[PDB]
Amino acid sequence: PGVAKSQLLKAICKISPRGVYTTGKGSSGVGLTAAVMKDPVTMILEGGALVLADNGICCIDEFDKMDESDRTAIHEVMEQQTISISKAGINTTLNARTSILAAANPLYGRYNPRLSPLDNINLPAALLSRFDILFLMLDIPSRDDDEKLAEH
Amino acid sequence: VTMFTEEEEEEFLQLSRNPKLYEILTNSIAPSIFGNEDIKKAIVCLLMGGSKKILPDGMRLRGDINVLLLGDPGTAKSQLLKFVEKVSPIAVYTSGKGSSAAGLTASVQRDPMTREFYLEGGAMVLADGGVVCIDEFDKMRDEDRVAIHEAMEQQTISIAKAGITTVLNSRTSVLAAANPIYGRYDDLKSPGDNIDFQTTILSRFDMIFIVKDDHNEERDISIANHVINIHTGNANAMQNQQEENGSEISIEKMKRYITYCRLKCAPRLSPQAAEKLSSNFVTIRKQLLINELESTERPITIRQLEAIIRITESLAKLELSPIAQERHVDEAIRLFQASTMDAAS
Amino acid sequence: APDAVFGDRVRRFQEFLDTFTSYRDSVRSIQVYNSNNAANYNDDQDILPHRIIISLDDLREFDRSFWSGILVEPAYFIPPAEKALTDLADSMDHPWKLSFKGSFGAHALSPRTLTAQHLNKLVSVEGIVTKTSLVRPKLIRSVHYAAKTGRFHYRDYTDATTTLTTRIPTPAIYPTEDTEGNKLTTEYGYSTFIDHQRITVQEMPEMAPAGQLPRSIDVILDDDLVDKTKPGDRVNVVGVFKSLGAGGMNQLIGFKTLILGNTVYPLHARSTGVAARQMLTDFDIRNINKLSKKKDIFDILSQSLAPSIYGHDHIKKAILLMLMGGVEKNLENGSHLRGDINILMVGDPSTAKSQLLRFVLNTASLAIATTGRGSSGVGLTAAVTTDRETGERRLEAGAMVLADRGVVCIDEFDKMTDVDRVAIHEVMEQQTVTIAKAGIHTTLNARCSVIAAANPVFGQYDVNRDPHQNIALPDSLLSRFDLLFVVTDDINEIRDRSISEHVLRTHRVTIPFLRKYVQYAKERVIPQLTQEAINVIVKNYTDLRNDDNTKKSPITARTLETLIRLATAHAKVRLSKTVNKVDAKVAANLLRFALL
Amino acid sequence: PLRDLDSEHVSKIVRLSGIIISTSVLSSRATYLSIMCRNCRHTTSITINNFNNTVSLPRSCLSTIESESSMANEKNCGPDPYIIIHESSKFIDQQFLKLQEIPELVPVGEMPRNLTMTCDRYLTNKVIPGTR
Amino acid sequence: GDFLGQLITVRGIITRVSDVKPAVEVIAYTCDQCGYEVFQEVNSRTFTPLSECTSEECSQNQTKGQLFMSTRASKFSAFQECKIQELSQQVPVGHIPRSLNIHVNGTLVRSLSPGDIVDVTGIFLPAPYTGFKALKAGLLTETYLEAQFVRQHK
Amino acid sequence: VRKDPITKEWTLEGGALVLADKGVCLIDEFDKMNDQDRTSIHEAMEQQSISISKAGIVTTLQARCSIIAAANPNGGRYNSTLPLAQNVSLTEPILSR
Ligand SMILES: Nc1ncnc2c1ncn2[C@@H]1O[C@H](COP(=O)(O)OP(=O)(O)O)[C@@H](O)[C@H]1O
Ligand SMILES: Nc1ncnc2c1ncn2[C@@H]1O[C@H](COP(=O)(O)OP(=O)(O)O)[C@@H](O)[C@H]1O
């Protein structure tokens, strides 16, 4: 945890125009997508954050703790512009030019070589196949790397 | 009603200086229930309420005590807890956490008109400065049990729901009555082994009593033929009326008597009685040290001393004087040892 | 022309206003400051209202008649005294209102029992601020330009609320085509306006009975008194209970009531709102300046906070430091760097764990006790508004939102579900809460300090099995908390002796001096790091990575961020401006007892 | 019992007993009041006793009905001119309780019935609802 | 509420943007008998159609005309509005952010995406409106802001 | 506390055990009864009086019913040699009462 990834996660959606910072549970499966409410003075589709943050980058915390239905929408973004809705009166397939940054934490404990890749991962590899680029945030306590970081 | 007449003060003072006063009140609770003479004692001191120190030190302590009535069915402890409400001026009887429509903990319901937040109800808000009767503590739902696990230490259940952030007072007194698994087999195991979660719940209490059932054929007739006379022709109730000529002239008089005893007197112990307890609390802890190390396995608390120290003022509130004596304390150790003989074995 | 009655109330109160010269220097300082306030705004480049606090003390020792007349029929003595007071403002150099501060056992009753009695009197009411309405300005004076004549005009409008006397109502239609037929072109800006607000006050829940339906009344505010209260506080209100309106006798009950002519006083709760109104005299701070010139006062303040608890020396030392809160330095166009400190303790029961908590609550300021579950609105606001004025969505500030710049008391931390624990990573690390539901996605700020308390999993097994997984908590929550205190169950006789006479003398320098010394250090004592602060902790933190990992775990760079905070809060106690090496010598020892 | 209240019991002294549901929020009627004619400048005062619709403000300035020559010699206050000077008036309470019949006997086939209450001055703020 | 009529500068977050729809300003009216064109200016929220004719030549005559409006001769205006939430940085320590109504007219429309950071400058005018009927204290003025210039951060 | 769709005011509606005071109530299928029902039957045979804590109301209504059951065995028509408390799926205190 000591890499301070969220220092960069707030920084990216800050400089970049059309940048919405999102969390895990604070949006549900209906929150970040659109919704239908009664219009004021002027029954339109009130959109969510991914509806808002199109042609921009969405910053996402704790994808491990989403809803399982909320995972299904994310697979629907890996094919572009597709958000399908089959609710009570809505059949829309709205478009979205969004961009995805995700950051999840590993399993209980930290970096067991006895554990395998996908053993310390709480997501199926078909989702990992949709990720072109993946990083790992190691923390090896090394003697020589500290003094520059301490002076930092 | 707080204030009252002068002749009612005087008839209290006549009853006050009787040296048989502890005995006559420990013959006052259950003429309907034969036996349970130690249980007959421990009910009284709980109904008095101990001291309450509101020191310049940032916290206050607690006055009321809590007693468990774990044991076999057929005890007529159900009949006993009904009589507890009859003694108490205000008290709430609960079987489990659930009544038919009444909750037990601090519920906050929004008013459907005007959309207003108010205190809906429960039990601890109601019986503030009174008696709480809870049945089936271990057969109990456990979503709000933590609120019960705080009220018996600070008398102040805090509520931090969506509307308000208030801290109220609730100076109630809880009487627990658990139910062992498999009856007398709970004493065939280790003396815990009732609460499936753990027995650290039991460490937060004071007095623990075990109800047994040992067959004795002459006692079997005496426990029977005592109660047949209760039923028909109200003969023991008529026998009460000649005891009414000599002892315990009313329930509701004693009800008013406790209320005058509670809020008036400000008792305090004696410093030479403190060195008796320090010589006693160490040696029991030393005995618990010996029974730990020789049996090489594992409970006494410092709240056990907090249980010891409060029985004196309950007996002092009987005695109505603000001071204490040596034999004024030493009677409780005999009664408290009855609370610890159930503990070890 | 006034009658003889009106001038006699003036000259009698003018006699009182000439009697005591304390209020003379008050209005003098009002005029001189606002003159100097406009002087600096209009000389280099090329606020305060008009009301003065008068106690309810001196009127009893001056005029018991004029005492009595106010307390029954205030609608005869309030206008001439203000007219006499505006005379004093004009003579020594606009409403110029007053306060009527003062405690009286006459009419300090509950609002629950207020109705139908003591009407048209002055009543002091306290209670709960709820459902605050919107701030609107009010039209008073209209300005009109006529085109062809080229002149302006003049027109006023009044309502029955302000005047306090039932005067003959004369409505006037908003003007158009006045004299000959020139168009009355409207203007603005020079047309004057005054804000306006109405609110409802529920009674005190601590004063309330066990359970019954609460009943309330309404209060309309005035110009300098709009928006002093958020909904959800405890506020005393002093004003006049007035009933207006034609009570149904025109053509089934009229005579709706309200209270006007008001002063607003927010008061401290047990767990809500500000308690920082505590004064500091020069006599007070001279004692603090005499106190801070010593060398061992950290020990005395450490031993002070256990008034009835034996032991736990190094635990109490941090409880000073959390209320110090550390320093905050937000970066230039970057992010903030978190300064406060969050601690969890663990130990066996009946070992002063619950004997610590309200002491943390009552001594500190703006604390909220959070017990058991925290579901649906503790860390959130839930946005549930069905506001009848318009279809819209607003917020109701939750406890984690409400406890900003304060302390959150978490009781029985292990019984919390994993649902709200998602928010705790968001709260404790980014110091913000973003709520994104389908109505409005939001973002707010909360930088609370956190103390939680969890139990062991099973038994008292605090040392027997292994130091790891006595809690079985998620892994990042180890990194969230700064120090993890373990309280043992050491059985002795010398230790039992120290327990013995402590509790015995219990049942048979100070706290109010302390919180004066605390809140003074917040606004002037922040320090700045010096060169000597580097050289020790660089050598020390390498030892923390090289050899503590051979004993326990984990070691992140986040731990070094706490090493900054400990030396920071220690310099706040000594009120130094630099940072000394000794502050690190204290801070280095604090990790050893907390871990090893 | 509440079950049998015939039309022969209209406006007669009838007692009963039941269970009180819930109170209301206290309003206020008026008893004594001073008024003013908004044209004539004519003031009187009105007291009432049986306030339990009954009376309202009159519709004439009433200075015309005067047994004096020089005042009746000196227009129209009309229409209804009276505006209540509220600064010197007198007020009372009004309660509106609500009572329900006792459900122990005969509400078996039906739903329970109820009535509508109203109490006077010292009778307000008396009873916590629910008792017998 | 003392800054009414001034020219100001605010900033915040564009929230709940409405749609652009035309606002009618003045309506033409063809006589069809006298052959004039009647013009009615509306500055209120709602209005009414007018009478059979208001000519000078249809006047002082027995048989007046009967009119009807026209679409292509009227003048319209681009209209759309939105709400601005507080910047959430200068908010006091225990408060909840409010909102504010801003009307936008004419050329500057279709220039404000929701959820942004923008400097809005304009002039501060009331609108004739009060809330509930019984809560009216007699002169209740509901305000708004008219947009004049957009300067966006980012 | 419920309102009536025939009439809209709040009316207190006691239970059938509130109704059957000095009467006999007939309740069956105890296995398909909730914990809401199960606390009610527990309190009713306990002290013959039902307390409530609704909106602004706290009363204690009495109940002197007599309960006659009609159960349903679990699985088999008569399960095994195992006793009735083992045969039934209910609890011990309602068996005691
Ligand atoms: N010593 C006794 N004297 C009188 N009655 C008794 C005695 N012991 C038991 N009873 C009877 O036992 C019954 C109470 O059962 P009880 O053990 O209280 O049930 P539980 O404790 O399981 O709720 C009462 O009806 C009472 O008549
Ligand atoms: N060192 C001590 N000095 C004085 N009293 C103590 C000490 N340790 C425990 N106590 C007693 O323990 C009680 C508090 O129990 P506590 O440990 O706070 O509850 P829990 O473990 O359930 O959170 C207090 O009444 C206090 O008298």
Q: What is the DSSP string of C319-387?
A: HHHHHH-----PPTTS--------EEEEE-SSSSSTTSHHHHHHHSSSEEEEES--TTTTS--TT----
Q: Which of C484, C518, C186, C474 is nearest to C324 (CA)?
A: C518
CA dist., res. C73 & res. C68, Å (int): 9
Protein residue closest via CA to atom 1 of ligand 2: C310
> For C253-296, where are the alpha helices, taking DSSP H only?
282-291
B79 lines ligand 1 (CB under 6 A): yes
Coarse DSSP helix, strand, coil percentages of chain C, rounded to the nearest 5 percent: 35, 15, 50
Q: Is F18 on the interface with D (CB under 8 A)?
A: yes
DSSP B211: B
CA dist., res. C194 & res. C224, Å (int): 9
How far apart, in Å, are the Cα atoms of C125 and each of B46, C34, C161?
Answer: 40, 33, 20
Q: What is the CATH number of domain C2-107?
A: 3.30.1640.10
| Residue B183 phi, psi dihedral angles, 5° rounding | 70, -115
Residue B262 C-alpha to ligand 1 middle, in angstroms?
30
Q: N- to C-terminal Cα distance for chain F? A: 29
- Measured between beta carbons, which residues in chain F are less than 8 angstroms from residue B116? none
Are A9 and A19 contacting, i.e. CB atoms less than 8 angstroms apart?
no
The neighbours of chain A, by the rule of 3 or more Cβ pairs under 8 Å, are C, E
> For B144-297, where are the alpha helices, taking DSSP H only?
145-154, 200-203, 217-231, 235-244, 251-264, 271-293
Q: Which two structure tokens, joined as six digits, stand for C15? A: 């006699």
How far apart, in Å, are the Cα atoms of B27 and each of B6, B256, C443, C578?
Answer: 28, 18, 68, 75
Q: Which of B16, B20, B68, B14 is nearest to B210 (CA)?
A: B68
- The number of CA neighbours under 13 Å toward the Cβ of A42 is 15
Q: Which of A101, A82, A107, A106 is nearest to A93 (CA)?
A: A82
Q: Is E92 on the interface with C (CB under 8 A)?
A: no
CA dist., res. C542 & res. C66, Å (int): 78
Amino acid at B247: S
| Residue A73 phi, psi dihedral angles, 5° rounding | -70, -35
Q: N- to C-terminal Cα distance for chain B? A: 47
CA of D17 vs chain C CAs: smallest distance (Å): 22
- Measured between beta carbons, which residues in chain B are less than 8 angstroms from residue C355? 59
For residue C357, which ligand has an atom nearest its CA?
Answer: 2
- The number of CA neighbours under 13 Å toward the Cβ of F21 is 17
How far apart, in Å, are the Cα atoms of E150 and each of A71, C522, E110, E147?
Answer: 39, 41, 11, 8
Q: Is F24 on the interface with B (CB under 8 A)?
A: no
Are A105 and A111 contacting, i.e. CB atoms less than 8 angstroms apart?
no
CA dist., res. D18 & res. D131, Å (int): 8
* CA angle at C471 for the pair C468 and C473, rounded to the nearest 5°: 100
Cβ–Cβ below 8 Å for F35 and B82: no
| Closest chain B residue to the Cα of F34, Cα to Cα | B100
Determine which of B75, B100, B105 to mutate to test the interface with F (most F C-beta atoms within 10 Å): B100
The residue whose two tokens read 């396995």 is B297
- Measured between beta carbons, which residues in chain B are less than 8 angstroms from residue C351? 302
Polymer length of chain F: 97
Q: Which of C377, C444, C394, C384 is nearest to C133 (CA)?
A: C394
Q: N- to C-terminal Cα distance for chain E? A: 31
Q: Is F44 on the interface with B (CB under 8 A)?
A: yes
C-E contacts at Cβ under 8 angstroms: 76
CA dist., res. B112 & res. F33, Å (int): 29
Residues 60-79 of E with CB under 8 A from C: none
Q: Which of C363, C175, C378, C402 is nearest to C272 (CA)?
A: C402
Are E42 and E24 contacting, i.e. CB atoms less than 8 angstroms apart?
yes
Q: Which of B86, B118, B85, B125 is nearest to B103 (CA)?
A: B125
CA of F94 vs chain D CAs: smallest distance (Å): 25
| Residue E138 phi, psi dihedral angles, 5° rounding | 120, -45
The three state secondary structure string of C467-506 is CCCCCCCCHHHHHHCCEEEEECCCCCCHHHHHHHHHHHHH
Are B303 and B207 contacting, i.e. CB atoms less than 8 angstroms apart?
no
How far apart, in Å, are the Cα atoms of A52 and each of A28, A98, C495, F83?
Answer: 16, 9, 64, 66
CA dist., res. C33 & res. C30, Å (int): 6
Range C559-576 burial, b when 16+ CB lie within 10 A, else e: bbbbbbbbbbbbbbbbbe
Which atom number of ligand 1 is nearest to the Cα of residue B71? 21
CA dist., res. C229 & res. C265, Å (int): 9
Handedness of CA C500, C505, C507, C512 (dihedral sign): negative
Handedness of CA C579, C582, C583, C588 (dihedral sign): positive
Handedness of CA C402, C403, C404, C405 (dihedral sign): positive
Which atom number of ligand 1 is nearest to the Cα of residue B32? 4
Contacts of F25 (CB under 8 A, 6+ apart): F16, F17, F19, F65, F66, F67, F68
CA of F79 vs chain D CAs: smallest distance (Å): 40
The residue whose two tokens read 């579900």 is C417
CA dist., res. D124 & res. D28, Å (int): 11
To test the pocket of ligand 1, the residue of B29, B32, B33, B134 to mutate (highest count of ligand atoms within 8 Å of its CB) is B33
CA dist., res. C547 & res. C555, Å (int): 10
Cβ–Cβ below 8 Å for E16 and C440: yes
Cβ–Cβ below 8 Å for C511 and B56: yes
For residue C414, which ligand has an atom nearest its CA?
Answer: 2
C355 lines ligand 2 (CB under 6 A): yes
Are C57 and C102 contacting, i.e. CB atoms less than 8 angstroms apart?
yes
* CA angle at B16 for the pair B12 and B22, rounded to the nearest 5°: 120
The three state secondary structure string of C220-249 is ECCHHHCCCCCCCCEEEEEEEEEECCCCCC
Amino acid at B192: G
Three-class DSSP category at B275? helix
Cβ–Cβ below 8 Å for D22 and F10: yes
Is A112 annotated among the ligand-binding residues? no
CA dist., res. E143 & res. D121, Å (int): 46
Which atom number of ligand 2 is nearest to the Cα of residue C308? 4
CA of F4 vs chain B CAs: smallest distance (Å): 16
Q: Which two structure tokens, joined as six digits, stand for D12? A: 């007669």
CA dist., res. E136 & res. C443, Å (int): 34
Structural domains in chain B, CATH included, are 6-344 (3.40.50.300)
Q: Is C389 on the interface with E (CB under 8 A)?
A: yes
CA dist., res. B58 & res. C359, Å (int): 6
Three-class DSSP category at B319? helix
Q: Which two structure tokens, joined as six digits, stand for B128? A: 């503030």
- Measured between beta carbons, which residues in chain C are less than 8 angstroms from residue B60? none
Q: Which of A25, E17, A38 is nearest to C386 (CA)?
A: A38
Which atom number of ligand 2 is nearest to the Cα of residue C506? 4
Residue C308 C-alpha to ligand 2 middle, in angstroms?
10
Count of C-beta atoms within a 10 Å radius of residue C487: 16
Q: Which two structure tokens, joined as six digits, stand for D70? A: 């020089």
B76 lines ligand 1 (CB under 6 A): yes
| Residue F20 phi, psi dihedral angles, 5° rounding | -95, 30
Coarse DSSP helix, strand, coil percentages of chain F, rounded to the nearest 5 percent: 30, 15, 55
For residue B153, which ligand has an atom nearest its CA?
Answer: 2
Q: Considering CB atoms only, which of C159, C189, C402 is closest to E4? A: C189
Residue F96 C-alpha to ligand 1 middle, in angstroms?
11
Experimental method: cryo-EM
Q: Which residues of A touch E (CB under 8 A)?
A: 17, 20, 40-42, 44, 52
Q: Which two structure tokens, joined as six digits, stand for B78? A: 């159900």
CA of B324 vs chain F CAs: smallest distance (Å): 40
Three-class DSSP category at C315? helix
Contacts of C97 (CB under 8 A, 6+ apart): C49, C50, C51, C82, C222
Q: Considering CB atoms only, which of F4, F9, F57 is closest to D130? A: F57
Are B97 and B104 contacting, i.e. CB atoms less than 8 angstroms apart?
yes
DSSP C175: P
The per-residue DSSP string of D42-98 comes to ---EE--S---------SS--SSS-S-HHHHH-----S--B--BGGG--B--B---E
Resolution (A): 4.8
Q: Is C143 on the interface with E (CB under 8 A)?
A: no
Q: Is F23 left (phi over 0), alpha (psi -120 to 50) or beta?
A: beta
CA B291, chain centre distance (Å): 29
Are C504 and B278 contacting, i.e. CB atoms less than 8 angstroms apart?
yes
How far apart, in Å, are the Cα atoms of B121 and each of B173, D126, F18, F38?
Answer: 17, 22, 22, 21
Residue B324 C-alpha to ligand 2 middle, in angstroms?
26
Are C8 and C75 contacting, i.e. CB atoms less than 8 angstroms apart?
no
CA B300, chain centre distance (Å): 19
Handedness of CA C38, C41, C42, C43 (dihedral sign): positive
Query: Breaks in chain E at C–N > 2.5 Å: after which residues?
Result: none
CA dist., res. E49 & res. E59, Å (int): 19
Amino acid at E113: S
> Which element (helix H / strand E) includes C524?
helix C511-524
Polymer length of chain E: 154
CA dist., res. C129 & res. C202, Å (int): 6
Handedness of CA A117, A120, A123, A128 (dihedral sign): negative
- Measured between beta carbons, which residues in chain A are less than 8 angstroms from residue C426? 23, 26, 61
Annotated binding site of B: 71-78
Are E107 and E33 contacting, i.e. CB atoms less than 8 angstroms apart?
no
Are C424 and C403 contacting, i.e. CB atoms less than 8 angstroms apart?
no
CA dist., res. F85 & res. B182, Å (int): 13
Are C494 and C507 contacting, i.e. CB atoms less than 8 angstroms apart?
no
Q: Considering CB atoms only, which of F10, F18, F58 is closest to D21? A: F10
Amino acid at C548: D
Are C535 and C582 contacting, i.e. CB atoms less than 8 angstroms apart?
no
Amino acid at B149: H
Looking at the DSSP assignment, which residues form a beta bridge with residue C369? C409
Protein residue closest via CA to atom 22 of ligand 1: B73
Q: Is C213 on the interface with F (CB under 8 A)?
A: yes
Long-range contacts of C353-359 (CB under 8 A, 24+ apart): C353/C453, C353/C487, C354/B150, C354/B153, C354/B154, C355/B59, C355/C308, C355/C309, C356/C309, C357/C409, C357/C411, C357/C453, C358/B58, C358/B59, C358/B154, C358/B156, C359/B58, C359/B59, C359/C305
Cβ–Cβ below 8 Å for B99 and F43: yes
Contacts of B66 (CB under 8 A, 6+ apart): B152, B173, B174, B175, B176, B205, B206, B207
- Measured between beta carbons, which residues in chain C are less than 8 angstroms from residue F55? 213
CA dist., res. B240 & res. B217, Å (int): 27
